[PDB]
Ligand SMILES: C[C@@H](c1cccc2c(-c3ccc(CS(C)(=O)=O)c(Cl)c3)c(C(=O)O)[nH]c12)n1cc(CCCN)nn1
Ligand SMILES: [Zn+2]
């Protein structure tokens with residue numbers, strides 16, 4: 133009823149949207165992984181009379197439910213999607229999107245890693261993002277490669293019209309006590325990558341983590357703090 137939805141409030145298979153700003157929503161879904169249930173976020177950005185989707189809803193059935201929720205709540209077609217790294221919470225559901233007429237995109241690095249991992253593979257490569265600090269425009273957002281953090285390929289997304297910073301899994305929520313799933317992470321480089329985000333987007337008003345509650349710029353420093361403590 134208006135608060136940001138939490139893991140115990142979303143059954144696996146259902147998707148909720150949350151209005152972040154004019155023409156900006158997050159999407160929240162839940163999924164089981166290795167015997168535990170986790171929430172995950174993505175983003176929806178209005179692109180005229182179309183929508184840009186950032187990240188799947190972590191699975192084929194969740195992503196079908198995401199498209200149905202968008203049709204119910206927004207009623208504009210999703211025409212393009214960007215996956216911000218290669219894990220299943222970002223690309224799982226790309227096949228559903230592709231069969232629904234959505235053009236799917238990711239960096240070449242993400243596409244290679246997804247293919248090697250056995251995950252679904254976005255169709256189109258996003259060039260111009262291979263060096264840390266790189267940025268490119270994509271419809272109503274800017275895509276930014278901060279360097280290795282949660283994964284080597286992780287991208288962040290900025291919505292300039294609303295000063296919304298979607299950090300993806302490179303950014304953790306304020307309640308986080310550990311660096312999450314670090315199997316593919318670079319803990320030594322992650323603080324430097326967060327510092328690049330902080331320097332590039334100093335006017336961000338909302339920061340959305342890959343999992344958990346949005347907040348302000350403090351999520352960036354908190355993330356650096358938890359990652360440094362974990363690495364130790
Ligand atoms: C598919 C993905 C994946 C699966 C399950 C959980 C997570 C989390 C996460 C996120 C937050 C917390 C709480 S917190 C910050 O710790 O307090 C935790 Cl516990 C965990 C993250 C994230 O952090 O983005 N991602 C998750 N996934 C798979 C793989 C390797 C697969 C190899 N076969 N790597 N990630
Ligand atoms: Zn991940």
Ligand SMILES: [Zn+2]
Nearest residue numbers: 221301342343
């Ligand atoms: Zn994640």
